[PDB]
Amino acid sequence: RPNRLIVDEAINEDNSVVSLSQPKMDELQLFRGDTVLLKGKKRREAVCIVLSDDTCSDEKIRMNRVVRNNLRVRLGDVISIQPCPDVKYGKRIHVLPIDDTVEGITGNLFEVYLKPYFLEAYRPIRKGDIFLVRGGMRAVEFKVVETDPSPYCIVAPDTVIHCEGEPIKREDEEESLNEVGYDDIGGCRKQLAQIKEMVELPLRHPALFKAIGVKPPRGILLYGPPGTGKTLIARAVANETGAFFFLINGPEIMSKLAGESESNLRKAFEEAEKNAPAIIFIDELDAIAPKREKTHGEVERRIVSQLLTLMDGLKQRAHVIVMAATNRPNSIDPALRRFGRFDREVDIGIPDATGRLEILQIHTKNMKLADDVDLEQVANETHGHVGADLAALCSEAALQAIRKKMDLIDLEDETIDAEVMNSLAVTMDDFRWALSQSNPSALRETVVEVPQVTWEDIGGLEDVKRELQELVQYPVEHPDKFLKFGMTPSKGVLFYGPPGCGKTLLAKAIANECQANFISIKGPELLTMWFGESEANVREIFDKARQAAPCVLFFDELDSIAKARGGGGAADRVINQILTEMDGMSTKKNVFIIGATNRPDIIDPAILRPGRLDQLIYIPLPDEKSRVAILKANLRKSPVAKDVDLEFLAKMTNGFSGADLTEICQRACKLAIRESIESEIRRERERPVPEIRRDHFEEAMRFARRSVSDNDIRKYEMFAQTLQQSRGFGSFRFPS
Amino acid sequence: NGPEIMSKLAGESESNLRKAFEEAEKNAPAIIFIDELDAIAPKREKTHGEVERRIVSQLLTLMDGLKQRAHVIVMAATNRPNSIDPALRRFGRFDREVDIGIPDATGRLEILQIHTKNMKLADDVDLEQVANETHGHVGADLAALCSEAALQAIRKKMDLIDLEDETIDAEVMNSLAVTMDDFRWALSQSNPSALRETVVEVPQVTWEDIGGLEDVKRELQELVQYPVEHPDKFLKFGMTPSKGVLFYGPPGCGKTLLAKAIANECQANFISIKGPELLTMWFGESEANVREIFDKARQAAPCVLFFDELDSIAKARGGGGAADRVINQILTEMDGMSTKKNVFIIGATNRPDIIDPAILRPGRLDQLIYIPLPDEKSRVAILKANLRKSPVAKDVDLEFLAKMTNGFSGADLTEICQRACKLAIRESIESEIRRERERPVPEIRRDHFEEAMRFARRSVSDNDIRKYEMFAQTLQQSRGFGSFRFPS
Numbered sequence A: 001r002p003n004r005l006i007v008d009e010a011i012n013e014d015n016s017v018v019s020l021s022q023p024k025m026d027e028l029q030l031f032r033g034d035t036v037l038l039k040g041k042k043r044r045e046a047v048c049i050v051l052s053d054d055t056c057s058d059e060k061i062r063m064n065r066v067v068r069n070n071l072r073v074r075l076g077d078v079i080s081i082q083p084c085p086d087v088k089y090g091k092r093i094h095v096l097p098i099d100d101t102v103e104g105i106t107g108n109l110f111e112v113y114l115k116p117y118f119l120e121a122y123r124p125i126r127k128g129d130i131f132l133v134r135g136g137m138r139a140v141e142f143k144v145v146e147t148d149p150s151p152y153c154i155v156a157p158d159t160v161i162h163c164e165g166e167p168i169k170r171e172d173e174e175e176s177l178n179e180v181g182y183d184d185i186g187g188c189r190k191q192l193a194q195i196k197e198m199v200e201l202p203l204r205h206p207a208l209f210k211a212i213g214v215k216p217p218r219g220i221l222l223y224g225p226p227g228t229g230k231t232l233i234a235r236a237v238a239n240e241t242g243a244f245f246f247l248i249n250g251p252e253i254m255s256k257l258a259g260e261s262e263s264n265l266r267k268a269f270e271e272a273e274k275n276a277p278a279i280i281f282i283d284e285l286d287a288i289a290p291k292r293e294k295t296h297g298e299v300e301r302r303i304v305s306q307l308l309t310l311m312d313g314l315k316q317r318a319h320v321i322v323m324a325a326t327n328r329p330n331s332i333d334p335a336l337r338r339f340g341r342f343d344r345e346v347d348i349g350i351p352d353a354t355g356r357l358e359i360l361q362i363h364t365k366n367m368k369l370a371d372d373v374d375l376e377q378v379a380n381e382t383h384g385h386v387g388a389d390l391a392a393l394c395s396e397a398a399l400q401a402i403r404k405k406m407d408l409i410d411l412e413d414e415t416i417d418a419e420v421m422n423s424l425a426v427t428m429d430d431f432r433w434a435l436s437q438s439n440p441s442a443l444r445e446t447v448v449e450v451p452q453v454t455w456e457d458i459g460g461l462e463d464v465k466r467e468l469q470e471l472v473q474y475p476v477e478h479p480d481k482f483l484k485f486g487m488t489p490s491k492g493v494l495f496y497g498p499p500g501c502g503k504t505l506l507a508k509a510i511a512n513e514c515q516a517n518f519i520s521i522k523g524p525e526l527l528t529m530w531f532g533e534s535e536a537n538v539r540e541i542f543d544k545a546r547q548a549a550p551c552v553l554f555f556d557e558l559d560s561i562a563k564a565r566g567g568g569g570a571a572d573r574v575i576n577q578i579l580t581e582m583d584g585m586s587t588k589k590n591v592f593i594i595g596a597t598n599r600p601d602i603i604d605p606a607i608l609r610p611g612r613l614d615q616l617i618y619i620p621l622p623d624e625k626s627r628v629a630i631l632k633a634n635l636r637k638s639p640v641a642k643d644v645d646l647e648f649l650a651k652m653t654n655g656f657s658g659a660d661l662t663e664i665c666q667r668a669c670k671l672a673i674r675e676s677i678e679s680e681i682r683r684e685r686e687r688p689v690p691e692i693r694r695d696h697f698e699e700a701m702r703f704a705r706r707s708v709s710d711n712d713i714r715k716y717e718m719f720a721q722t723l724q725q726s727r728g729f730g731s732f733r734f735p736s
Numbered sequence B: 001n002g003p004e005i006m007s008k009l010a011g012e013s014e015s016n017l018r019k020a021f022e023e024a025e026k027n028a029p030a031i032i033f034i035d036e037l038d039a040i041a042p043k044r045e046k047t048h049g050e051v052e053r054r055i056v057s058q059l060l061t062l063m064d065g066l067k068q069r070a071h072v073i074v075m076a077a078t079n080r081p082n083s084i085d086p087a088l089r090r091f092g093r094f095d096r097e098v099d100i101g102i103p104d105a106t107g108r109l110e111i112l113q114i115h116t117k118n119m120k121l122a123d124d125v126d127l128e129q130v131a132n133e134t135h136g137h138v139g140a141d142l143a144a145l146c147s148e149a150a151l152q153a154i155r156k157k158m159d160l161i162d163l164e165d166e167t168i169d170a171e172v173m174n175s176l177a178v179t180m181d182d183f184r185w186a187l188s189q190s191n192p193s194a195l196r197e198t199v200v201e202v203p204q205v206t207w208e209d210i211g212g213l214e215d216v217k218r219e220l221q222e223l224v225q226y227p228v229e230h231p232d233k234f235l236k237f238g239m240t241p242s243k244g245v246l247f248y249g250p251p252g253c254g255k256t257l258l259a260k261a262i263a264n265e266c267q268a269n270f271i272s273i274k275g276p277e278l279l280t281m282w283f284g285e286s287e288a289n290v291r292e293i294f295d296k297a298r299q300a301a302p303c304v305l306f307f308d309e310l311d312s313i314a315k316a317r318g319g320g321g322a323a324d325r326v327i328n329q330i331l332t333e334m335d336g337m338s339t340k341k342n343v344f345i346i347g348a349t350n351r352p353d354i355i356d357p358a359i360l361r362p363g364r365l366d367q368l369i370y371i372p373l374p375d376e377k378s379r380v381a382i383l384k385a386n387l388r389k390s391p392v393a394k395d396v397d398l399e400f401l402a403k404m405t406n407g408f409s410g411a412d413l414t415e416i417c418q419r420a421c422k423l424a425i426r427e428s429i430e431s432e433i434r435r436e437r438e439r440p441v442p443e444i445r446r447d448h449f450e451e452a453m454r455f456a457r458r459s460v461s462d463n464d465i466r467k468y469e470m471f472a473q474t475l476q477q478s479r480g481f482g483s484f485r486f487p488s
């Protein structure tokens, strides 16, 4: 029947809920909240609530792991759908905790966290399948045995959910939801989808590779700082996609008595190729196979060469993927990067911004979060933390809450039931204490981010916004028209203008609008690389942009090296290496190399050349209309009272940049907070204000900073004229 | 394998090394391939263990004793020749270096068709464009690029043909048509493996791509093409042909273009050493790398070596006495390569006044060719060559645009035509998105050039053009000897 689709990872967290596209929903005869019934590859069915999501196509039907392990359907398989609506309100259903997840958890766990979830929202029920409930810091898999003599059941107040719990073991057909999967990684979206596309076809359908002459991907080089989830990602898309996952430690093979270690290395590969299409994971390929040139012993050279020969001979069987984990690609010997041996690098990188947020919800869903936690704030607070730190941060705050409840509940030495854990509510105190205690593991590594700065956060510069969106967004969506006229699109823009005017903000907005990774190389980094004669690190930065494509590379303070030299002939070491890497990356056509200069007059003229930063966009001081938008964008988060006059503050400030207005609004916020704190402490010492009042802005404007004024604004205009190059050719007309 | 012999238990590894040579000399005239001679025989001086020294010495003795049988070739693979111990380069032991180098330009194209002939390519793929797109990729990357695009097409067809777990026949594969989407996605996903290595290329720039400079073209074709095809007449008169030309003139006027055209006309390899490379070697005190560059030109002969921005090192010092580190090593290597007579050492200076006078000497860059700003006639050819690929409407007046622009270099006219193309593409995209939001232009119209000429750049003008002319006079050295006649 045409009512059969392909499964996709669900963007929601609700269990027994199917998210489908609206045209497919009406083609499938589905209403807004109609129950949709599914038939899997094996003898099991599960009725689910339909959901209208616009992020998926008709064929892509979103499903959780909950409605995937019971349906015996892996990610990227065919699901059969047929509706069958009957009332059938459940009469004394037989949901049971029968599994291996109920260990050391006793008490009223049968109903404490089932009433808020399993007895709410009229969710559909089925027998023979297993759903999941996350409560009391516990993710419990509950199976249901009887749901009335019908394959379609809906929960009801008379379902009773009577208690018949047993330690009955699970069957091998069902997959453990406690085991990792696609939903257990949140900090990586593009990098996880890369591995998905890489290894879904070779693993799910090895017969196609055996049939069609292709070179299957046999070798992965997942690299990144330790604790970023490379092992987690390997286990996730090796058990959810594949069926066997080997986890040789790395130090285990470097530790054993030479011959036995190599025997284990051979035997792991053999068992991978003997059992089924599997994934071999080398967690410490940097340790097993370091740079052979710098090695001293020869038995380690024998280990490296034996690994090389095993990988070269692993071209057979057409179905075995070999994932390898390391901290950086320039530390492995330059022989594990050859064709057929870890030729694909899928660099993970530090989790960035909302990605860290997307990690926290994975380690908090089983836990509780009360109602006062600012997960976005703690996500912006945890800068420089790999996913392991966020797992520890979510575990240290939970342990802080538990240890604060230990004094409340004294003498407790039992299973501690599951009701007090349900009553546990981790607040901002525990998370703040854990964040203060937690230490970043990967902070000095350059962060590859997708910025949260949008066009709404950019005040004014409408002409600059139009030029940017017609210069970088145009080629990425209309390549045919660019190819027809025979012109390589301009890559690289040098934003010149007054400092603190919105160049980094504009670059971040460009990165966010195109949903591309953003690498900001600030002036401190360039000056550090210049002073220590570390220009060879510049290459690494570009290599990072090559491994995080598409990138919106931003060289903030491109004149910082020129400023540090006095402000002869320019052409410094780091700037020259930047020029060389720009010439190298001009053929990438996937990374943008945006620059920035707060003093464009003292700059290397080589930076202004085709292939390099040819297009020049001037970021002028905001005018009367632009300052209103700048102040509104800098005060959207702040609770500003309506009685203030921002469009008059725009009129009064004439030569104020975006940074100056941001300082003005931040000082107004500071005075508002100071007055609120003074009032609160005075009331506490005796026994307030809900918004930034007018007087706060009145007092803040007394320290109104104008960083750039008069001749400085002239200089850019001078550099404008010298770079506008009208040269008297304006208003030039051809003859008829 | 190489690592196979470095991996086994010493004695068994050497037994396999002996037995491979024996079976090669026992069966028939064969070829022994050492895929990792760099791994089997690294620099013996820097090695720590002695059993690896035993391996290196045993390989050396086997190769020395391989002078027999008169029919066994022994190929060896490595990443660079300066990493092997300086004993596997002796006579009779890998004495011939046949350096492969990164595939260059159309060569990468010539690789793609090898990995695409068995595959399909639909009808919209621009193989030349993706060949120009895959800069810095070895043939393995192109094999993976042709395999990742094919796999992208297959995986996009997996959703169309559901439930397929069979041999998948051969008819749907015939119906498979890899388009530009798959190749673009694979190129974005693919990572270059050899990008930092210097590229040895045969340029696609021909004399047709060079606008104007007919006298310079004639001088070049009579100065470098003449000796390579008439050596007997050069030998008869007793004169070593001039090797090395210093192109001086305004920047962005066609010096690199002329060098590439010279390389393409003679079908010789082209090595471009730009100003960034020289400045990097000067700043890091890496002048020893200059040798390597010349060594590359020695292993890619014939070469048309081009030192773009030969005054870049002098510019970075202020613009005393010149004679910088990298320029001095370049002088030494020029003196070394003056006896090659197979590589040309063309230079380029956008500011020839501040240059090392040692660079102007016999054996070194003696001949000097001035690349002047294009005149009224040359600008027509420059604009036509820069607009051959672009679909320019016939109603435009390029020979009038040549008249209007006076001090415009080739780079300035190229920027003008590129900006006209940019405005044409912008108008086309605006019209298309407006039609899509409501429901165009087929060529670069007149108004596009009209708007582009409003930002007409003149990079070099007035006294700058004087300076080269000054350097012309100081180097023309008429000295009053013009119109000098012998007595009868």
Ligand SMILES: CN1CCC(NC(=O)OCC#Cc2c(F)cc(OCc3nnc(S[C@H]4C=CCCC4)n3-c3cccnc3)cc2F)CC1
Binding pocket: A471, A472, A473, A475, A476, A477, A478, A479, A480, A482, A483, A486, A487, A488, A489, A490, A491, A510, A511, A514, A516, A550, A551, A552, A589, A590, A591, A592, B129, B386, B389
């Ligand atoms: C006159 N002579 C004749 C022969 C030859 N001319 C020819 O025949 O070919 C012309 C072409 C082209 C082209 C391309 F080379 C890359 C493209 O893809 C866009 C894209 N994808 N990602 C990016 S980065 C972006 C991702 C968004 C966030 C930021 C970074 N860009 C892109 C965007 C802007 C600039 N540059 C590349 C499309 C093309 F049409 C040379 C000249």
Ligand SMILES: CN1CCC(NC(=O)OCC#Cc2c(F)cc(OCc3nnc(S[C@H]4C=CCCC4)n3-c3cccnc3)cc2F)CC1
Binding pocket: B223, B224, B225, B227, B228, B229, B230, B231, B232, B234, B235, B238, B239, B240, B241, B242, B243, B262, B263, B266, B268, B302, B303, B304, B341, B342, B343, B344
């Ligand atoms: C007065 N004292 C008396 C005794 C002695 N004089 C004498 O008796 O001998 C004179 C001679 C000679 C000669 C030669 F030494 C090399 C030749 O071959 C040409 C060639 N082949 N490839 C190249 S490079 C080219 C390949 C094309 C693309 C670019 C690079 N060139 C070549 C071309 C231009 C300049 N130089 C070499 C021919 C000769 F006739 C010394 C002076």
Ligand SMILES: Nc1ncnc2c1ncn2[C@@H]1O[C@H](COP(=O)(O)OP(=O)(O)O)[C@@H](O)[C@H]1O
Binding pocket: A184, A185, A186, A187, A188, A225, A226, A227, A228, A229, A230, A231, A232, A233, A325, A351, A358, A359, A362, A386, A387, A388, A389, A391
């Ligand atoms: N992107 C992520 N999302 C969720 N959890 C993560 C992420 N990255 C790391 N973690 C957590 O950090 C831990 C890292 O463990 P592991 O993957 O074995 O080591 P490594 O990350 O060094 O390979 C995992 O237990 C995982 O729960």
Ligand SMILES: Nc1ncnc2c1ncn2[C@@H]1O[C@H](COP(=O)(O)OP(=O)(O)O)[C@@H](O)[C@H]1O
Binding pocket: A457, A458, A459, A460, A461, A498, A499, A500, A501, A502, A503, A504, A505, A596, A629, A630, A633, A634, A657, A658, A659, A662
């Ligand atoms: N056009 C603008 N709209 C909104 N905020 C701006 C604008 N320009 C600057 N800002 C504010 O200035 C602050 C710093 O700006 P910055 O990016 O450092 O300027 P520049 O790029 O000139 O150095 C940011 O917090 C931002 O909120």
Ligand SMILES: Nc1ncnc2c1ncn2[C@@H]1O[C@H](COP(=O)(O)OP(=O)(O)O)[C@@H](O)[C@H]1O
Binding pocket: B209, B210, B211, B212, B213, B250, B251, B252, B253, B254, B255, B256, B257, B348, B381, B382, B385, B386, B409, B410, B411, B414
């Ligand atoms: N004589 C010419 N004919 C055609 N195009 C030219 C000419 N001179 C320069 N150009 C154009 O200028 C651009 C860059 O020139 P370039 O080789 O950098 O000049 P220079 O060698 O003086 O630095 C090239 O894309 C080329 O198309």
